[PDB]
mmCIF file of N, CA and C and ligand atoms in Angstrom:
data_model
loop_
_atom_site.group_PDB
_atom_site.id
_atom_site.type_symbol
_atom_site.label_atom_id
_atom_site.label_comp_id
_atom_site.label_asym_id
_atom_site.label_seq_id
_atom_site.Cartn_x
_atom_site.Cartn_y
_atom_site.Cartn_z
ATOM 1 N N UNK A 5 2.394 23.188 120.267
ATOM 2 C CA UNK A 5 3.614 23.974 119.923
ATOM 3 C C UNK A 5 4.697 23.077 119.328
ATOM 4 N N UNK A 6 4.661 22.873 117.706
ATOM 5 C CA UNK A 6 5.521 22.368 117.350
ATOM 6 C C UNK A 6 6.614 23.376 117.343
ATOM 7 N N UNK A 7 8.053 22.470 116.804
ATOM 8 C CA UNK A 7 9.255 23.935 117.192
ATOM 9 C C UNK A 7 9.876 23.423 115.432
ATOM 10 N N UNK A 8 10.040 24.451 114.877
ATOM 11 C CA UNK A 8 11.144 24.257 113.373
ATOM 12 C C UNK A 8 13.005 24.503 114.215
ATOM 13 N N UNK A 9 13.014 23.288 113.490
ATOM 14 C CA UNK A 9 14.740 23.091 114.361
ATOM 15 C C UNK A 9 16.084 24.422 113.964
ATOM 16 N N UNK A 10 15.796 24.772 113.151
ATOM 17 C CA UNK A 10 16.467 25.924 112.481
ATOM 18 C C UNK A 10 16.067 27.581 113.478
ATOM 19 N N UNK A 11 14.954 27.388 114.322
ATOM 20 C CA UNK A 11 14.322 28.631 114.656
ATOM 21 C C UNK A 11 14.336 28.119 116.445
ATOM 22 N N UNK A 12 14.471 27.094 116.498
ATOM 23 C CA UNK A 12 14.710 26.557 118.100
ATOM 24 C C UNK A 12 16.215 26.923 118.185
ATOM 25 N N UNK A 13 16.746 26.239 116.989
ATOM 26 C CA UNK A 13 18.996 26.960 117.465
ATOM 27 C C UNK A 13 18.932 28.513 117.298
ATOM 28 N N UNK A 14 17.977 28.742 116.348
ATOM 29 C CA UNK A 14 18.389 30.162 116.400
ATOM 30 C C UNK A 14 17.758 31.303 117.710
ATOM 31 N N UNK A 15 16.421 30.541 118.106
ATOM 32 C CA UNK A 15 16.400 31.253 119.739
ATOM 33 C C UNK A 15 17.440 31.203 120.496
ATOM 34 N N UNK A 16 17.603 29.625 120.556
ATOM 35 C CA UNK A 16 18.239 29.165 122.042
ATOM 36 C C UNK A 16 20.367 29.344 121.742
ATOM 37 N N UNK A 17 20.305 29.673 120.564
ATOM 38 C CA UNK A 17 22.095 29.895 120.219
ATOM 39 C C UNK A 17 23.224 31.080 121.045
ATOM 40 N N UNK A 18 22.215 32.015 121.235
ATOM 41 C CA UNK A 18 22.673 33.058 121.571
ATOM 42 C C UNK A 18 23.195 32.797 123.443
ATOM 43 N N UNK A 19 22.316 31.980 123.922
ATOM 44 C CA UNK A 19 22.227 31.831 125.204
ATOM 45 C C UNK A 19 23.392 30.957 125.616
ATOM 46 N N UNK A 20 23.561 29.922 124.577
ATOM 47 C CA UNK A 20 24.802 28.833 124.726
ATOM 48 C C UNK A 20 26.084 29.682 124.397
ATOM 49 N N UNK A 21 26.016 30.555 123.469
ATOM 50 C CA UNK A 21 27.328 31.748 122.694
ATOM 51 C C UNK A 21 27.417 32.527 124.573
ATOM 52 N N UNK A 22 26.926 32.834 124.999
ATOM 53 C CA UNK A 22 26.986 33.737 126.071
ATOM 54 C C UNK A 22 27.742 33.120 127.053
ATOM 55 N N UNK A 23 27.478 31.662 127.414
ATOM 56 C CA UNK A 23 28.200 30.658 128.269
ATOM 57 C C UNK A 23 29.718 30.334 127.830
ATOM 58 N N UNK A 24 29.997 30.343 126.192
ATOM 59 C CA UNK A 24 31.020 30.242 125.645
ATOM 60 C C UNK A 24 32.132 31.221 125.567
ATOM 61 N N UNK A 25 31.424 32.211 125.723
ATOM 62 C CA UNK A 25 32.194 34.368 126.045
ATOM 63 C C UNK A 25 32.895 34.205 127.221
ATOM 64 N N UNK A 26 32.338 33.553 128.188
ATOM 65 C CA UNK A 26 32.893 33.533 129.362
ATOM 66 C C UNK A 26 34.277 32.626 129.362
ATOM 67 N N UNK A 27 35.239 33.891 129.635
ATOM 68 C CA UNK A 27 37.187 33.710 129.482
ATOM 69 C C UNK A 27 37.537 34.041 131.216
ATOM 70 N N UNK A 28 37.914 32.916 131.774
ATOM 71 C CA UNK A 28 38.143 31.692 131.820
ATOM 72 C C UNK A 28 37.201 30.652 132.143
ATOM 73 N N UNK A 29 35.690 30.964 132.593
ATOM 74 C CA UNK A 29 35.401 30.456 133.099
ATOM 75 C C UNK A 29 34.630 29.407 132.400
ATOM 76 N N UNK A 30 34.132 29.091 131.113
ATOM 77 C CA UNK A 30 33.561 28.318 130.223
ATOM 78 C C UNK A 30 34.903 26.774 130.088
ATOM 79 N N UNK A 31 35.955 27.430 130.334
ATOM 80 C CA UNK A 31 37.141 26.794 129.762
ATOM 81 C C UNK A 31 36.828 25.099 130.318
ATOM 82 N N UNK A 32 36.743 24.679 131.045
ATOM 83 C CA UNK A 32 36.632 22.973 131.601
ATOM 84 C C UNK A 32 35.516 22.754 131.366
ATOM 85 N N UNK A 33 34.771 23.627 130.550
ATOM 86 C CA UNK A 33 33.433 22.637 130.030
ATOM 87 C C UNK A 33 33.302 23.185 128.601
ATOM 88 N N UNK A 34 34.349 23.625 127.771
ATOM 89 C CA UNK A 34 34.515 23.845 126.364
ATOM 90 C C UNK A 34 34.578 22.096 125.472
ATOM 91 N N UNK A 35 34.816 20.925 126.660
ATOM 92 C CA UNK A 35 35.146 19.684 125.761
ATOM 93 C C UNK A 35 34.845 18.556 126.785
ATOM 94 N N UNK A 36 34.523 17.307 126.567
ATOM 95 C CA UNK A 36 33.991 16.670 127.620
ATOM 96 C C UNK A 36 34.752 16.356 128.615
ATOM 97 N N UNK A 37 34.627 15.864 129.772
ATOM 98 C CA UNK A 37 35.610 15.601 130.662
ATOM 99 C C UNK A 37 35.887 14.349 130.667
ATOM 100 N N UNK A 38 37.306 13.775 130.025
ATOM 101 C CA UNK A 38 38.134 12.220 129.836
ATOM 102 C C UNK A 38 38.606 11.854 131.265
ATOM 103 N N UNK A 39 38.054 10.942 131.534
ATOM 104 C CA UNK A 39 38.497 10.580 132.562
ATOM 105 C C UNK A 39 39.454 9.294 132.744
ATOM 106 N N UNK A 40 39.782 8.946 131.599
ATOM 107 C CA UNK A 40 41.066 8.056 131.210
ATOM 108 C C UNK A 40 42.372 8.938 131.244
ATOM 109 N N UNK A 41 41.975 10.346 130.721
ATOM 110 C CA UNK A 41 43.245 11.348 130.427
ATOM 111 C C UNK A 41 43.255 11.717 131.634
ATOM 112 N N UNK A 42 42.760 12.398 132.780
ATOM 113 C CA UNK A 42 42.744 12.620 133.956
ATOM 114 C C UNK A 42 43.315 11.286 134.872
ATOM 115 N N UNK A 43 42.848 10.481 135.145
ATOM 116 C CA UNK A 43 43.173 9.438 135.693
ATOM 117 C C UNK A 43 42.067 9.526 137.177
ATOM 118 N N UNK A 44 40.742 9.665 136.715
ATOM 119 C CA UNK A 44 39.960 9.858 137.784
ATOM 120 C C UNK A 44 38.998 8.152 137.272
ATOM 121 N N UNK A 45 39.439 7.197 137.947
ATOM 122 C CA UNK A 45 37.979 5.936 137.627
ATOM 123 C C UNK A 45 36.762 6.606 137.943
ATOM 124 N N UNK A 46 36.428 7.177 139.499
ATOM 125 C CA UNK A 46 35.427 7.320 140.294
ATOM 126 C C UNK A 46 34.551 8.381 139.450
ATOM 127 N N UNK A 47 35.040 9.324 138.570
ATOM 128 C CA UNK A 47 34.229 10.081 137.345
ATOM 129 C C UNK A 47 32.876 9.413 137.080
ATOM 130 N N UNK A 48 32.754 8.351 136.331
ATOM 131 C CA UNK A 48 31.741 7.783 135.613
ATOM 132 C C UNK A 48 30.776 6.860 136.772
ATOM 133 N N UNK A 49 31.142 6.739 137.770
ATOM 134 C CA UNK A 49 31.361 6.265 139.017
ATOM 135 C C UNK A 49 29.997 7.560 139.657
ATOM 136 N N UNK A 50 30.059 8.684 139.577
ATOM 137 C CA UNK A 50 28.999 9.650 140.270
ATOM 138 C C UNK A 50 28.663 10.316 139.229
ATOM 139 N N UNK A 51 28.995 10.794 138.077
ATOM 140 C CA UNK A 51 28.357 11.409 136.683
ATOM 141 C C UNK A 51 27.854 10.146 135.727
ATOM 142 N N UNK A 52 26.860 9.741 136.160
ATOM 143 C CA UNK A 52 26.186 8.777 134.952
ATOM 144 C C UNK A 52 25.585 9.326 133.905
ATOM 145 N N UNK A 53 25.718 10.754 133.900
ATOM 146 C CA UNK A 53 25.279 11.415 131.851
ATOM 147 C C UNK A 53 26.454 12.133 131.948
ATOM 148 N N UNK A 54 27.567 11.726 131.387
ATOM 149 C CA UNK A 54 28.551 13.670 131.003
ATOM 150 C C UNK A 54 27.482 14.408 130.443
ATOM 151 N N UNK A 55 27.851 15.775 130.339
ATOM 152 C CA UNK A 55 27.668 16.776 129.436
ATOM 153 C C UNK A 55 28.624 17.776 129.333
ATOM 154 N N UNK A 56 28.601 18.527 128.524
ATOM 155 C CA UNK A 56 29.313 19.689 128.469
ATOM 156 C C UNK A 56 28.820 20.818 127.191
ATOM 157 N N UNK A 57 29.664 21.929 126.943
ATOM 158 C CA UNK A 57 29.130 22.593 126.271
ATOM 159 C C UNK A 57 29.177 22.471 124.706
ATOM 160 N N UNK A 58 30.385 21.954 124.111
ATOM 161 C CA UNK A 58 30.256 20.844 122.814
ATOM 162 C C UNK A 58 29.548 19.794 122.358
ATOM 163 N N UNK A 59 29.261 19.285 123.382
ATOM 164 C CA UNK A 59 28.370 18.343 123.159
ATOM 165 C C UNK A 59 26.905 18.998 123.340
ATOM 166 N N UNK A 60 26.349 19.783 123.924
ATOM 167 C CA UNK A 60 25.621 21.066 123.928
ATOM 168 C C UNK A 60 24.934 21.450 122.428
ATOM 169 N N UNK A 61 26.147 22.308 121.742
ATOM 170 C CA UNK A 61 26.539 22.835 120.600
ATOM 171 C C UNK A 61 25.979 21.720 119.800
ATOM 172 N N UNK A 62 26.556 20.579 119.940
ATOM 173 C CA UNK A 62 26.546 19.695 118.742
ATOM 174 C C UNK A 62 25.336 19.284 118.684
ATOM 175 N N UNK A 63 24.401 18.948 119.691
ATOM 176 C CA UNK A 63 23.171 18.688 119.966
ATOM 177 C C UNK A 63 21.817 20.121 119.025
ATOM 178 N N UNK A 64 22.622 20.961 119.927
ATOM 179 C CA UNK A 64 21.942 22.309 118.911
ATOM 180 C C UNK A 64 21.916 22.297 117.211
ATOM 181 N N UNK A 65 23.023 22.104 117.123
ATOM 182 C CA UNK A 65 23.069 21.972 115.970
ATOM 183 C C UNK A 65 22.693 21.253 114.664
ATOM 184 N N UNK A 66 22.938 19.869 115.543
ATOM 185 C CA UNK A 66 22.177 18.933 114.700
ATOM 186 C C UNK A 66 20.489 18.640 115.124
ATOM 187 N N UNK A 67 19.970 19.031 115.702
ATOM 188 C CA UNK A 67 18.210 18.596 115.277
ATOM 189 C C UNK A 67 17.923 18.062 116.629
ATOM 190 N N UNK A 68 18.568 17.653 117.555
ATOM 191 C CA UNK A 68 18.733 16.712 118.592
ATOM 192 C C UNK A 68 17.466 17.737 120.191
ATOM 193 N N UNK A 69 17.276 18.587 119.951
ATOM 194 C CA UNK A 69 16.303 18.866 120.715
ATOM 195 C C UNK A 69 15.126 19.247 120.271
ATOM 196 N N UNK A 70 14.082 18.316 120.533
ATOM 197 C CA UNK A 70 12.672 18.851 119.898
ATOM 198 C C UNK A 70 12.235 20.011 120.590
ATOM 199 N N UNK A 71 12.415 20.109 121.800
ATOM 200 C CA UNK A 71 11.713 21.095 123.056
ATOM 201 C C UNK A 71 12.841 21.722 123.488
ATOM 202 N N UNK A 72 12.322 23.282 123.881
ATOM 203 C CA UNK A 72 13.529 24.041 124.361
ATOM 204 C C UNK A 72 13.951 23.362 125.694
ATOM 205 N N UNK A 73 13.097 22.471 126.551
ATOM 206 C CA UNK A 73 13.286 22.055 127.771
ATOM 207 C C UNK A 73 14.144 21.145 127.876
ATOM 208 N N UNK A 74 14.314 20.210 126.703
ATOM 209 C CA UNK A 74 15.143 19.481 126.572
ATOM 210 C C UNK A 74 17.056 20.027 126.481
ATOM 211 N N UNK A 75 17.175 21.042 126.093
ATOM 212 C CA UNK A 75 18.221 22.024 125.944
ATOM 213 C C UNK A 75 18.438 22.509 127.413
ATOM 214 N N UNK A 76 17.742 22.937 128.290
ATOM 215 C CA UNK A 76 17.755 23.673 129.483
ATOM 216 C C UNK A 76 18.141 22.840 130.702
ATOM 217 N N UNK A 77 17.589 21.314 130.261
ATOM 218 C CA UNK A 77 18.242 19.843 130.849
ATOM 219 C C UNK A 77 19.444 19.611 130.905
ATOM 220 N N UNK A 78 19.852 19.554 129.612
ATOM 221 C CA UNK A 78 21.131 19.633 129.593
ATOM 222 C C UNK A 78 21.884 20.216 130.152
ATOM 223 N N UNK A 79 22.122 21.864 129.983
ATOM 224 C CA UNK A 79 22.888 22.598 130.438
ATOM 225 C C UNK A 79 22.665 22.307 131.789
ATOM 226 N N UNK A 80 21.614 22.709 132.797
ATOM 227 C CA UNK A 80 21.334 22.124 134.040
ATOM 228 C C UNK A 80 22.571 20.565 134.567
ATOM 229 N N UNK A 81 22.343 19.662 133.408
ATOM 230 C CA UNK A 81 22.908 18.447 133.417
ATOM 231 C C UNK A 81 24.661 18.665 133.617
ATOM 232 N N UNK A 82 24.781 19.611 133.271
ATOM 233 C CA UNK A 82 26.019 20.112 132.455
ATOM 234 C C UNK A 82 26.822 20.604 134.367
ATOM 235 N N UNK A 83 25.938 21.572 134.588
ATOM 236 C CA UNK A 83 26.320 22.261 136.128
ATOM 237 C C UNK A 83 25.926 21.271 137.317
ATOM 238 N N UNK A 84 24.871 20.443 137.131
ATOM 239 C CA UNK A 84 25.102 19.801 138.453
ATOM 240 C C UNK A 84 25.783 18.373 138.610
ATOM 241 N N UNK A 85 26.385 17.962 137.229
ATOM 242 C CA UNK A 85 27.745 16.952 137.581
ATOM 243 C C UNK A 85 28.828 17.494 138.141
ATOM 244 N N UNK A 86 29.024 18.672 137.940
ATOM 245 C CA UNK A 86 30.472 19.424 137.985
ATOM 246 C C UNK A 86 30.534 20.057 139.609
ATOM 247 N N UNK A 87 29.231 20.237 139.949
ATOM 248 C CA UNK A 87 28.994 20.702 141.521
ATOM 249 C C UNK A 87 28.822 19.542 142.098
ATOM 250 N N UNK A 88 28.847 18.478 141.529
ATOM 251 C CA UNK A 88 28.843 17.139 142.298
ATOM 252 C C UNK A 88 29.724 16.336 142.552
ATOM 253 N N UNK A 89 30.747 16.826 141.756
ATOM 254 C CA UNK A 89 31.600 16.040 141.263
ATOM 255 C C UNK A 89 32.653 17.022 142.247
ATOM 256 N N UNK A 90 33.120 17.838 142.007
ATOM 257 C CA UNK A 90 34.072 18.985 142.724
ATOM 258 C C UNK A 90 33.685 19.486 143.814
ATOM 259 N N UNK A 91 34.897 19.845 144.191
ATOM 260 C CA UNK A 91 35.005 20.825 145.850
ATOM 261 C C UNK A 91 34.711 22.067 145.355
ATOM 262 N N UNK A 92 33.601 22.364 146.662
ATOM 263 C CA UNK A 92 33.052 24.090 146.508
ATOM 264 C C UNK A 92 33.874 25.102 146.224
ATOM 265 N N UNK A 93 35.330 24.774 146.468
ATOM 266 C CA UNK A 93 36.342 25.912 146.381
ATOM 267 C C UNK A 93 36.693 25.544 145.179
ATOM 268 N N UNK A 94 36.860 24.594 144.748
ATOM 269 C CA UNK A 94 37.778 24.344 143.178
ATOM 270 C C UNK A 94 37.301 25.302 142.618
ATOM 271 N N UNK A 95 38.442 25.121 141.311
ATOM 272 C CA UNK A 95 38.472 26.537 139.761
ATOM 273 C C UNK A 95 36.828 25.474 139.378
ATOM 274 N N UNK A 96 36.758 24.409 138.943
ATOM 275 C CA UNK A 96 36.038 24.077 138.405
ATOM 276 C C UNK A 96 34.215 24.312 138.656
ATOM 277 N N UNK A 97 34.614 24.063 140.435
ATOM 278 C CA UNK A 97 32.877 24.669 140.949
ATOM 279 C C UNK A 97 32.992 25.977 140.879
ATOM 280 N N UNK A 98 33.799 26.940 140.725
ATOM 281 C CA UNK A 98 33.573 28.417 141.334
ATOM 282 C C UNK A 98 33.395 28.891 139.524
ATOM 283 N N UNK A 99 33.689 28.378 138.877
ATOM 284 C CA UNK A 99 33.373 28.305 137.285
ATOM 285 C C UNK A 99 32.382 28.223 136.850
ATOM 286 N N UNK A 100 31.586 26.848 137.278
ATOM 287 C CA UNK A 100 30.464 26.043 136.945
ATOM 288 C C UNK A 100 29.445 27.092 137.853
ATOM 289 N N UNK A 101 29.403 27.793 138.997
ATOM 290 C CA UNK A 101 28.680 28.663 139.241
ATOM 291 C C UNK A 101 28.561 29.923 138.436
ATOM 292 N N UNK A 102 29.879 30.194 137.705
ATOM 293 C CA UNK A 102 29.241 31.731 136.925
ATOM 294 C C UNK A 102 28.782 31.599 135.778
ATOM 295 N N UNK A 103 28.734 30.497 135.042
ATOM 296 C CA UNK A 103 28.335 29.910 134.272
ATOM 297 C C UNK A 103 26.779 30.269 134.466
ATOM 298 N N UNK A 104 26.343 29.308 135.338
ATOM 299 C CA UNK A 104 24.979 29.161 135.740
ATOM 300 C C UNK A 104 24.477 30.259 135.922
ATOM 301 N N UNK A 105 25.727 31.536 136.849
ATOM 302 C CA UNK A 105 24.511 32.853 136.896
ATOM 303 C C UNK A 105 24.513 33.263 135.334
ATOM 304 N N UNK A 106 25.298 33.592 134.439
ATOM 305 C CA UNK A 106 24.931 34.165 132.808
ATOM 306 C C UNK A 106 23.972 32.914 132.442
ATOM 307 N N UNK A 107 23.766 31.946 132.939
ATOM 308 C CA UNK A 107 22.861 31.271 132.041
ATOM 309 C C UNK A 107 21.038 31.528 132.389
ATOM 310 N N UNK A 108 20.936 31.525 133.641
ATOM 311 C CA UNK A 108 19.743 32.262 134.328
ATOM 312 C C UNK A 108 19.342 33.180 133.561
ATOM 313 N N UNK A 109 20.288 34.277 133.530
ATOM 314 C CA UNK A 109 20.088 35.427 133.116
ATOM 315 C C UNK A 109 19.548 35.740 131.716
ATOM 316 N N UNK A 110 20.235 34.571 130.878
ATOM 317 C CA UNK A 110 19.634 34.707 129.815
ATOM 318 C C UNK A 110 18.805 34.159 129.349
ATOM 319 N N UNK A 111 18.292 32.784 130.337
ATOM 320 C CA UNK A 111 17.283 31.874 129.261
ATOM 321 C C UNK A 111 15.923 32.176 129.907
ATOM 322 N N UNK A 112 15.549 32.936 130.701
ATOM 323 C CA UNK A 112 14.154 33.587 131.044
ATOM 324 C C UNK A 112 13.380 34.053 130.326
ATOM 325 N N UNK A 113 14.035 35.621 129.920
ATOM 326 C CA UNK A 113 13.004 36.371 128.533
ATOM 327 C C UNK A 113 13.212 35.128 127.147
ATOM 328 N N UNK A 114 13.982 34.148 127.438
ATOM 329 C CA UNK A 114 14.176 33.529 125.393
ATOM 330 C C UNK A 114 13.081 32.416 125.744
ATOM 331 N N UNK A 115 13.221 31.785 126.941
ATOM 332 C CA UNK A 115 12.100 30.634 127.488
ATOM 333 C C UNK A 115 10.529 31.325 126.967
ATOM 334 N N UNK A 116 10.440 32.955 128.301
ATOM 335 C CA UNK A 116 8.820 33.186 127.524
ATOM 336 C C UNK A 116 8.707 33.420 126.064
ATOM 337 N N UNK A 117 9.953 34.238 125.594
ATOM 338 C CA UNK A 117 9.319 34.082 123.771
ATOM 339 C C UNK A 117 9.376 32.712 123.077
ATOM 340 N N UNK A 118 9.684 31.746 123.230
ATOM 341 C CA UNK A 118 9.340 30.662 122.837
ATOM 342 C C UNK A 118 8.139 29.860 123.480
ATOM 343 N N UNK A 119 7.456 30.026 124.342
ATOM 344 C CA UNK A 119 6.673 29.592 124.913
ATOM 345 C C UNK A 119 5.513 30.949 125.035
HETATM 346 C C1 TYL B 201 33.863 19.998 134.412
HETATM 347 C C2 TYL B 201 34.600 19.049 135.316
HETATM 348 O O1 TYL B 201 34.007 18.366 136.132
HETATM 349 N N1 TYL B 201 35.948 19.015 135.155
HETATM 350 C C3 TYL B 201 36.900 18.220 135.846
HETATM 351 C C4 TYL B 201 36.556 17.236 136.766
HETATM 352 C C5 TYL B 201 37.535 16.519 137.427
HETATM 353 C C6 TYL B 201 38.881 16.758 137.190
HETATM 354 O O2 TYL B 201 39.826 16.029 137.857
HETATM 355 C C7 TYL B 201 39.244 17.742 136.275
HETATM 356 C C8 TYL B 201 38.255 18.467 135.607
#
């Protein structure tokens, strides 16, 4: 199963657009998290890959995933720094969870038609 990169963004686009719909809750992972601008050292300290959803995007976009699995990593990558990183009550974990449920939801039926 080779994948044409033009027909892998165009499966898997809709699923990342769906994570991005979400007002307010996409919002702290619309851009990476600076942790110079924050003033958090200990950041890079327990998140040894950022991710987020721009960097996501940009990955989609440019050619950067051969395999849809590689995409599904990410995002995965994306929610369990942010649940690792934050308190269960924060805006940021209670975010990073609804995130994750619209993302479930949608990458099941797009996973079996690509596979
Ligand atoms: C997605 C995320 O972890 N955001 C975030 C983490 C720490 C902080 O102090 C402010 C924001």
């Amino acid at each position: 199963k080779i994948f044409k990169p033009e027909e892998l963004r165009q499966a898997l686009m809709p699923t990342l657009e769906a994570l991005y719909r979400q007002d307010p809750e996409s919002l702290p992972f619309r851009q990476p998290v600076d942790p110079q601008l924050l003033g958090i050292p200990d950041y890079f300290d327990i998140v040894k890959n950022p991710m987020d959803l721009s960097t996501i995007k940009r990955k989609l976009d440019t050619g950067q995933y051969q395999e849809p699995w590689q995409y599904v990593d990410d995002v995965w990558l994306m929610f369990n720094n942010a649940w690792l990183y934050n308190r269960k009550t924060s805006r940021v974990y209670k975010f990073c969870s609804k995130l994750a449920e619209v993302f479930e939801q949608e990458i099941d039926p797009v996973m079996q038609s690509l596979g």
